[PDB]
Ligand binder design. Structure first.
Ligand SMILES: *[C@@]1(O[C@H]2[C@@H](O)[C@@H](CO)O[C@@H](O)[C@@H]2NC(C)=O)O[C@H](CO)[C@H](O)[C@H](O)[C@H]1O
Ligand SMILES: *[C@@]1(O[C@H]2[C@@H](O)[C@@H](CO)O[C@@H](O)[C@@H]2NC(C)=O)O[C@H](CO)[C@H](O)[C@H](O)[C@H]1O
Ligand SMILES: *[C@@]1(O[C@H]2[C@@H](O)[C@@H](CO)O[C@@H](O)[C@@H]2NC(C)=O)O[C@H](CO)[C@H](O)[C@H](O)[C@H]1O
Ligand SMILES: [Ca+2]
Ligand SMILES: [Ca+2]
Ligand SMILES: [Ca+2]
Lengths: 254, 252, 253
């Protein structure tokens, strides 16, 4: 437990779809596959403390599929809780683009378990960047029966909106006067962010007069909310600015 | 009351993991709100997810890889027998490492019959990836149908491209009037939908014209594959070079 | 080869599968993947298909993806172990998971005529959606199928914006001549999973021309997953009092 501290337990957190090659029956399915899964020991009808295949050969597998790429640090294997069935060695295969698949260690066997309940962790030689990952049992005791977990680095999710060409107008109010002067253009995002975004807001067109050879121009967001922000174009000192244009990039996390 | 919200289970937007299943026809396959099955055949099981162990340690977990704002959870009893959950607690996780309890684990009111849906709108919407219903009290058995209602999500894909350049002493450095130098840009991969493009200066080398600076950069002919980076000046200005970075984002 | 280069969604476990009904617990969506085959010597593992419990025109299997996909093709296949198959169906889909639509306004699409011969349907126009559903309309024997959806590959990006990286007032660019720089180290709020690309552009400029010439620049150097150095610079005889920039850093896959 300490050895995978701070990592995401994929199956525990229901972060992946699980597809199996075959299921012994309807109470031996991938619904029973989570590490340390335990069921009703007094009632036989809820089935096995494991996913168990129907066909017993070297062509079986369980696939965990994530739509968002992850960095897989480790796979834990465990035997069947309620009978002497466990997987003693297996192959790992994975895919990042879900078109081409690859074999970990070129398909060499990874060491599995030797009993019902003692978990055996395997940390991948190099962390594997993938969307989908599969356990392919190669050798077994009794039957192809397992519980398992995959451990990944935490993911971060961003949502970004770009908006183009926020403009002061021609011969705008920055083109007269002196001292600090601002022209404000309210901007509404196309959709409302779920959390407060950070906003980059940068020049794409500049039409301005120097003042004793000095250029002084700026643009900055103000009053950023989930819905929009005020685009503040500005100059200062004696500078006269005919126009300014900017594009923005707004990004919220998680 | 849930108009405009995404019905997660109905839309197959989440994986469902349960603590235990009574048997193979009482599983989370049967868990969607208003799920109804063959009333003339017993073999397809319950109009509910039903646990195998009946205690206060059961749960159904719904997992989303894309974070959601959970507005409401709806509970419903079992359609075909007098089994329902009378109260429950809610637990959730945003990062799938640390979990939290809604209301510090206090009970939320469930249902009182087979079919009448009881909506619970969270005191404050919950930002999370995974969410779990933990039954605390029940009538007859731990048996339920449910739904989670979230705000619609948006998905963006962004490509950054660096250092699109006019070249030194470019064509904008001679002549009068509106003048343009066009640099075609191809995105590293083709977007699925039409992107919007921010394209902004990172290097400027230009001459003033009667003290005026006039410079611009703008995309033209944006497609899913790329765009034309148009560097320009106008009037009498002479521009030796311009450089820009772009940010292209496509939605949905 | 017609689907060369496309993602096989179910085979890659890229979707959740919900069904209207399942005949029993060994005829579920666990058995729905194109070319799914099971133990032909043991009855207990059920059908080489998803099979409904109710036989009417109201059944369906829904495939849901959280990340939007461009659906190119749906492949239908009958039941491997009995003479049951879906001869026509409609396709429904949703992009936002609030409003649903029907392909061809709900007209039938041609299904299969036997147990095993796959019939591909390439959509008239590719469908942009999160969730998609096969709704059997006519069948032989029973509503029993295997299927696949084929999507364009997806790309996933993560972006961080940081604002207002600044030289300071009256910075080192404001004296001297030749190539001169001011370096401001930047640390990303979180570490990216893969190496980002960085856009870094001006939002505030305070500078003196040199014989009517403006010369200013800003560029990232030493980009890592953790951050970068923001290099503000000028050259020739220009004196630059200050420069400010915002950054956008994006990592792929
Ligand atoms: C500061 O304004 C000063 C600089 O622009 C300086 C450049 O040589 O010119 C002084 O005359 C300017 N002072 C005034 C009062 O106009 O500019 C920096 C940005 O570079 C900050 O914005 C300061 O707030 C402002 O005083
Ligand atoms: C417009 O061009 C005018 C401005 O640059 C103005 C600044 O004082 O100088 C006038 O000579 C310029 N007119 C011409 C014909 O060069 O600039 C704006 C952008 O600021 C638009 O591009 C207008 O279309 C253009 O006329
Ligand atoms: C190049 O520098 C030249 C330009 O700034 C030019 C503008 O008229 O003026 C020359 O005096 C400059 N040469 C020197 C040695 O300062 O500018 C480009 C970017 O535009 C590159 O940085 C070149 O490396 C540089 O020589
Ligand atoms: Ca622009
Ligand atoms: Ca750059
Ligand atoms: Ca800024």
């Amino acid at each position: 437990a300490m050895s995978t501290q701070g990592l995401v337990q994929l199956l525990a957190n229901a972060q992946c779809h699980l597809r199996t090659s075959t299921n012994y029956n309807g109470v031996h399915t991938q619904f029973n596959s989570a590490l340390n899964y335990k069921n009703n020991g007094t009632n036989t009808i809820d089935g096995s403390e494991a996913w168990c295949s129907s066909i017993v050969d070297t062509n079986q597998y369980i696939v965990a599929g994530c739509e968002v790429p992850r960095t897989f640090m480790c796979v834990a294997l465990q035997g069947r809780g309620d009978a002497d069935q466990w997987v003693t060695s297996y192959k790992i295969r994975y895919s990042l683009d879900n078109v081409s698949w690859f074999e970990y260690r070129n398909g060499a066997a990874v060491t599995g378990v030797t009993d019902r309940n003692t978990v055996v962790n395997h940390f991948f030689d190099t962390p594997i960047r993938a969307r989908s990952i599969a356990i392919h049992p190669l050798t077994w005791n009794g039957h192809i029966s397992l519980r398992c977990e995959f451990y990944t680095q935490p993911v971060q999710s961003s949502v970004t909106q770009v908006g183009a060409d926020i403009y002061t107008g021609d011969n705008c109010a920055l083109n007269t006067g002196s001292g600090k002067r601002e022209v404000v253009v309210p901007v509404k995002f196309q959709f409302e962010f779920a959390t407060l975004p950070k906003v980059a807001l940068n020049f794409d067109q500049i039409d301005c007069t120097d003042a004793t050879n000095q250029t002084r121009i700026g643009v900055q967001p103000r009053n950023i909310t989930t819905k929009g922000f005020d685009c503040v174009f500005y100059t200062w000192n004696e500078n006269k600015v005919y126009s300014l244009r900017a594009d923005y990039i707004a990004t919220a996390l998680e």
